[PDB]
Design an enzyme around this catalytic site. Structure first.
Site, short mmCIF file in Angstrom:
data_model
loop_
_atom_site.label_atom_id
_atom_site.label_comp_id
_atom_site.label_asym_id
_atom_site.label_seq_id
_atom_site.Cartn_x
_atom_site.Cartn_y
_atom_site.Cartn_z
N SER A 20 1.95 -9.52 -0.61
CA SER A 20 1.59 -8.11 -0.52
C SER A 20 1.80 -7.47 0.86
CB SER A 20 0.15 -7.91 -0.99
OG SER A 20 -0.73 -8.70 -0.19
N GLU A 72 -9.74 5.66 3.38
CA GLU A 72 -10.46 4.58 4.01
C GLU A 72 -9.51 3.40 4.15
OE1 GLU A 72 -11.81 4.61 0.10
OE2 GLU A 72 -9.74 3.98 0.51
N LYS A 115 0.80 -1.22 0.00
CA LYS A 115 0.00 0.00 0.00
C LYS A 115 0.84 1.27 0.00
CE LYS A 115 -4.08 -1.91 0.14
NZ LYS A 115 -5.00 -1.87 -1.03
C1 LIG Z 1 -1.51 -6.65 2.86
C2 LIG Z 1 -2.67 -6.44 1.94
C3 LIG Z 1 -3.68 -5.48 2.23
O1 LIG Z 1 -3.60 -4.78 3.29
C4 LIG Z 1 -4.80 -5.35 1.25
C5 LIG Z 1 -5.85 -4.46 1.43
N1 LIG Z 1 -5.94 -3.62 2.51
C6 LIG Z 1 -6.77 -2.65 2.81
C7 LIG Z 1 -8.10 -2.43 2.15
N2 LIG Z 1 -7.93 -1.49 0.99
C8 LIG Z 1 -8.08 -0.05 1.39
C9 LIG Z 1 -9.16 0.61 0.50
C10 LIG Z 1 -9.64 -0.58 -0.28
C11 LIG Z 1 -10.82 -0.66 -0.99
C12 LIG Z 1 -11.18 -1.92 -1.54
C13 LIG Z 1 -10.36 -3.05 -1.34
C14 LIG Z 1 -9.17 -2.96 -0.60
C15 LIG Z 1 -8.82 -1.70 -0.07
C16 LIG Z 1 -6.22 -1.70 3.89
O2 LIG Z 1 -6.97 -0.77 4.20
O3 LIG Z 1 -5.10 -2.00 4.32
C17 LIG Z 1 -4.80 -6.20 0.09
C18 LIG Z 1 -5.91 -6.11 -0.95
O4 LIG Z 1 -6.01 -4.88 -1.73
P1 LIG Z 1 -5.69 -4.77 -3.09
O5 LIG Z 1 -4.22 -5.08 -3.18
O6 LIG Z 1 -6.55 -5.74 -3.85
O7 LIG Z 1 -6.03 -3.34 -3.40
C19 LIG Z 1 -3.77 -7.09 -0.09
N3 LIG Z 1 -2.76 -7.20 0.80
#
Ligand SMILES: CC1=C(O)/C(=C\[NH+]=C(/CN2CCc3ccccc32)C(=O)O)C(COP(=O)(O)O)=CN1
Ligand SMILES: CC1=C(O)/C(=C\[NH+]=C(/CN2CCc3ccccc32)C(=O)O)C(COP(=O)(O)O)=CN1
Ligand SMILES: O=P(O)(O)OCCNS(=O)(=O)c1ccc(OC(F)(F)F)cc1
Ligand SMILES: O=P(O)(O)OCCNS(=O)(=O)c1ccc(OC(F)(F)F)cc1
Ligand SMILES: [Cs+]
Ligand SMILES: [Cs+]
Ligand SMILES: [Cs+]
Ligand SMILES: [Cs+]
Ligand SMILES: [Cs+]
Lengths: 266, 391, 391, 266
Positions: free
Chosen positions: B375, B107, B85
């Protein structure tokens, strides 16, 4: 058509429109139908009506909770269309507008949705999360079924948007009071005179101001600024939630308020 | 628009009219920054010297023993903040500054994007405001106070499922009233254009590094790259540089929750239906009537009833394949990586690992070279995982 | 012995006679491995591809604003496991395998060495047994279950101060009965020879990388490098490559606890007296009678009533300088880094940072280029720090 | 000297030595002095005595707790030397050995420590955490003050160590029963015959076996294997801790045991 006749008649009586908003089926199908009857009787010139949606991204807590109550009463879009048929059956001339979110329109096919609106006697549809940029299939479907597509003129509108809204829209132009989401507690303070004048220049459908209008003084200000009317949502809905224990005292408090708001438009 | 908002039928800008200027401003700022050598240098410097790029690519020899599978893990768990992230948050923060914004709305679900938003804002002088579902405040608690230590306001959301969707809704409502001073730092490759495009371009180094590293270590490209899919950012970051390498499979893994057949899952790409919400036309979990359903996953980060438009498109044309992994399969993978490689993965990343371990175990004599996007790290998940062990 | 066990008067092999063969075996294995290109390649590969070396060197521009101090942080917080402890644990594990040992005994205070011992053992196929003081089990709890997830046995020590010294005692007692199958993975640059020497050589990459990175970014060496001193491993890892660069100050920071004058501290180098314990002749906190005192620090990792012999020597000859930082000064530094750089440092590393911030603030127009060893991240400390905020 | 005369006399009576260990001042100065008197009366040939140390790295829980009790009674090294003077004053010929940890010896100067041992009538000192490799200043100070320095022969001893211990040591050679720390519960099983024979070959001071000896059968085995005697610590100390409520019943249970152990050495 119903909007055209409304604005024509209001022009002759030299007054603005008062258009209340409620959620269909809040707090139940039967009480909602009585609430709407009280609204028209108390002086509503037109209606703006919300179909309960799971995720109303343009609405604050009041109308959010209105949606929730309707959902507790098990209100579906199918029941909403049944209600609309009954409302039209009792009131043949009052303009009826729906506040929609895009998924409820897109769900069973955009064309089919507007065909159904026409069938029940709806006059306009405003889709809150469809900007002019995504509006094409929606406005084409609206016009094919003689539905007015409602477009939003925000305070941050430039000239290119003004002309788009003016040509694409029918029925009325929604003039936004402020940024943010629906809510009586937050009132729009910025002067909107220059936007009202330009819509008239490009011959847009007559303007209705909405968001944060919760007092007769605000209605009066909107009309004196040149807008053809005003829309009030959360103020109306607050009377529903604060009087859930008192259905009869609800309608009386609703009647008082709508009368006072409509008076200000004169 | 300057760029195409759609990937086939999916994408677009389904937001209230009020927010279109903000979206247009963001798009213009991005296009400009992409051509700006100074922006690119500043971004590269933060990634290298602050966040710690390039991240490692670790070969896991213990877990593949006795099979013809060679598995590497792209180590985004080693990135500052503990997850991928951080990459795109640094880029978006620099765009926020370039647009003269002083505030950040975000968010978070797993709290990793929230931590990332808070740290970037602390570093670059922005005031940060974070929405998080109250269930997620509980199950991902270490992240809640990391955010608060770094000067960010954390706002618990109690409405709806009290998870990610509900956090998003609140963040969106806030932004529609404060877009003049606040940049909305959307945390995934979803939402209205330009966000799916920007988030990909700012996560793209994942796949670029992987490609260089695998060529160096193996002398060829992987048979498949495998990533979990919440909204799609880590997966598209991994996938992007391989899209034109047709021999490389792209596998995205949605959460299967308690099982697809229970309806308690977060797999709208394969088990939902196209709808319009979150500012985009995309697969969603929805009722027959078109109400948005509540999703479910053991992992807060995958617990979201939609998916980014580019994955929906890559699936439709057959370029990428999407599968699901259940809570129990993700837990086994978590335990397996801890015990045999000494890496504690996030429960999100554990879905990706679980599917890789399935590819291996189902066909143990198939020769395959796989990369899993790890990730994030699982420090945020240790209390949750502890509590499930017992029963 | 093959190597000199002393640094001036300090060091030696003050262990029971039974353990001398084990110490001699370890020394011989190390000397042999240092000349073995295959060992060095295997070690380099784990450091790079598994642990994520080289770590970043981050310039902190916000915290030095308005002064003539330029501050860099060597980012050992970004190392796999979350601290510098991982470096030498990977080296010692490889020596354990080279000596045909199947088990590992370790002690831990902050839990970072314990995590490091557990992860290395999981990776390299060793059975790991970890002693930790029961107070430290409480105040550094996230680390306790990280260890257990990776297959390590964690043994709470209730005797004495129920902190690090007491963990060490138990580990030593265990090793004296199981040295035939178990390698004692001592966690710092202290104890009997060859441990102070081995731990330095396996932590030495910290200073080597720092030197290369600072020359690249600044075109010259630092005015001072600054590190916290528990037993001395992160500090000697940083110091080692600069010892012959006489223009470079070496500042080691001992914990001042509640204040040196309260006697509740962990600063035996500057405020203790030479004694014999923990297998070495070294400065210790001791009574007039020669009983070993209990130390105190807010940080579990510095809470140890002795120090490694090489620091005692570097001090005596004037090559390195040692200072102290109180609990409250370390807390302010912790908060400062979180809020202005978006990095959450370990409370141990926060002592080092605190002293650097003192050098800056006391003389704000003095032009100085400082490097602080940020030996770990503060995720393990967030609950502790939360609880102190209130009062 | 006292050791020389002891082993000479024991040789003439063709028996082995029984050497108990206790912590000085456990559970108090006065009870400890009575415990030691009971030990000598019940048949102790020599004594091995521990000065309470904060961190006894070579001791298991029993003797650890012995140290703790003494510390609760506020027993200092200075009081220990006062006790030793009283013990020597009552018993002029019994060999007295101290079990020391290095810091207590090094604290006020290594030379001064052994000078003080001589002054009070101590015969030998064993420093548990000083291997032959670090022994030089300790063994030089011992010999200057006519103190026997005690060296350890472990089971893992090679020939080079055997010869070192044989030349450096005086009084007796400590023959270790097993690896690990002191403890009655853990008994050493490995045969030690070949180490006993080689010490005699290089003319080491007579061997005493220690660690885990908690039964007359173990004493008998040690002497039959060729060792000049046996040392028992934790077994003795367990009788102290289990009878803290009963000082008189403590001494009776101590007497029985020491008699039984000494009998086995005959
Ligand atoms: C270690 C890891 C994460 O922390 C993660 C997600 N985390 C969020 C949720 N985030 C924040 C806004 C949001 C909206 C929709 C879906 C995810 C997210 C968070 O707020 O740490 C994902 C999966 O996320 P993608 O890589 O598919 O984007 C994979 N791996
Ligand atoms: C992030 C960080 C630490 O975690 C840390 C220490 N930690 C311990 C205690 N370790 C384990 C055995 C030991 C014996 C004596 C002193 C320290 C340690 C641990 O068990 O994570 C130190 C200070 O350690 P030095 O670098 O001076 O060696 C600095 N920084
Ligand atoms: O009085 P308030 O503040 O509750 O305002 C009531 C408004 N109700 S409404 O149906 O006109 C209405 C109109 C437009 C909306 O969204 C959009 F502007 F984005 F399109 C939302 C609600
Ligand atoms: O009967 P046990 O098992 O309690 O053994 C009693 C021993 N007491 S002692 O003073 O001889 C004794 C002798 C040597 C020791 O350490 C060393 F071997 F490392 F030098 C410790 C205690
Ligand atoms: Cs393999
Ligand atoms: Cs999802
Ligand atoms: Cs790196
Ligand atoms: Cs500066
Ligand atoms: Cs210390």
């Amino acid at each position: 058509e119903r909007y055209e006749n409304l604005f024509a008649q209001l022009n002759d009586r030299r007054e603005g429109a008062f258009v209340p908003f409620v959620t269909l089926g809040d707090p139940g199908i039967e009480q909602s139908l009585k609430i709407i009857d009280t609204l028209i009787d108390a002086g509503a010139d037109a209606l703006e009506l919300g179909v309960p949606f799971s995720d109303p991204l343009a609405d604050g807590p009041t109308i959010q909770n209105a949606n929730l109550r309707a959902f507790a009463a098990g209100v579906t879009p199918a029941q909403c269309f049944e209600m609309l048929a009954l409302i039209r059956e009792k009131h043949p001339t009052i303009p009826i507008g729906l506040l929609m979110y895009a998924n409820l329109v897109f769900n069973n096919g955009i064309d089919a949705f507007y065909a159904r609106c026409e069938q029940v006697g709806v006059d306009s549809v405003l889709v809150a999360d469809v900007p002019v940029e995504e509006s094409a299939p929606f406005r084409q479907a609206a016009l094919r079924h003689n539905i007015a597509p409602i477009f939003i003129c925000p305070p941050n509108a430039d000239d290119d948007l003004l002309r788009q809204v003016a040509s694409y829209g029918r029925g009325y132009t929604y003039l936004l009071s402020r940024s943010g989401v629906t809510g009586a507690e937050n009132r729009g303070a910025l002067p909107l005179h220059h936007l009202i004048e330009k819509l008239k220049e490009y011959h847009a459908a007559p303007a209705l101001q909405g968001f944060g209008i919760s007092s007769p003084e605000q209605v009066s200000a909107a009309v004196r600024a040149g807008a053809a009317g005003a829309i009030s949502g959360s103020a109306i809905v607050k009377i529903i939630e604060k009087n859930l224990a008192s259905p009869k005292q609800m309608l009386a408090e609703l009647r008082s308020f709508v009368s006072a708001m409509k008076a200000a438009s004169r | 628009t300057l760029l195409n908002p759609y990937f086939g039928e999916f994408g677009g800008m389904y937001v209230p009219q009020i927010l279109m200027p903000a979206l247009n401003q963001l798009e213009e700022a991005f296009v400009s920054a992409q051509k700006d050598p100074e922006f690119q240098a500043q971004f590269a410097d933060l990634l290298k010297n602050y966040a710690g790029r390039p991240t490692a690519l670790t070969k896991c020899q213990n877990i593949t023993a006795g099979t013809r599978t060679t598995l590497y893990l792209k180590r985004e768990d080693l990135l500052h903040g503990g997850a991928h992230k951080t990459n795109q948050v640094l880029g978006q923060a620099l765009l926020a500054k370039r647009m003269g914004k002083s505030e950040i709305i975000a968010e978070t679900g797993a709290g990793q994007h929230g931590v990332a938003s808070a740290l970037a804002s602390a570093l670059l002088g922005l005031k940060c405001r974070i929405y998080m579902g109250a269930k997620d405040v509980e199950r991902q608690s270490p992240n809640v106070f990391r955010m608060r230590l770094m000067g960010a306001e954390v706002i618990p959301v109690h409405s709806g499922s009290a998870t990610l969707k509900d956090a998003c809704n609140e963040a969106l409502r806030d932004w529609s009233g404060s877009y003049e001073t606040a940049h909305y730092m959307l945390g995934t490759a979803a939402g209205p254009h330009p966000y799916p495009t920007i988030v990909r371009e700012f996560q793209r180094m994942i796949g670029e590094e992987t490609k260089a590293q695998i060529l160096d270590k193996e002398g060829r490209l992987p048979d498949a790259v495998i990533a979990c899919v919440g909204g799609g950012s880590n997966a598209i970051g991994m996938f992007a540089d391989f899209i034109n390498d047709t021999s490389v499979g792209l596998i995205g893994v949605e959460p299967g929750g308690h099982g697809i057949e229970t309806g308690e899952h977060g797999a709208p790409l394969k088990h939902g239906r196209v709808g319009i919400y979150f500012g985009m036309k995309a697969p969603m979990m929805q009722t027959a009537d078109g109400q948005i359903e509540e999703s479910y996953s053991i992992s807060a980060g995958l617990d979201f009833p939609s998916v980014g438009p580019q994955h929906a498109y890559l699936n439709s044309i057959g370029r990428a394949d999407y599968v699901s992994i259940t809570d129990d399969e993700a837990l086994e993978a978590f335990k397996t990586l801890c015990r045999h490689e000494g890496i504690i993965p996030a429960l999100e990343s554990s879905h990706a690992l679980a599917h890789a371990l399935k590819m291996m175990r189902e066909q143990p004599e198939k020769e395959q070279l796989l990369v899993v996007n790890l990730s994030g790290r699982g420090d945020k998940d240790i209390f949750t995982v502890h509590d499930i062990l017992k029963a």
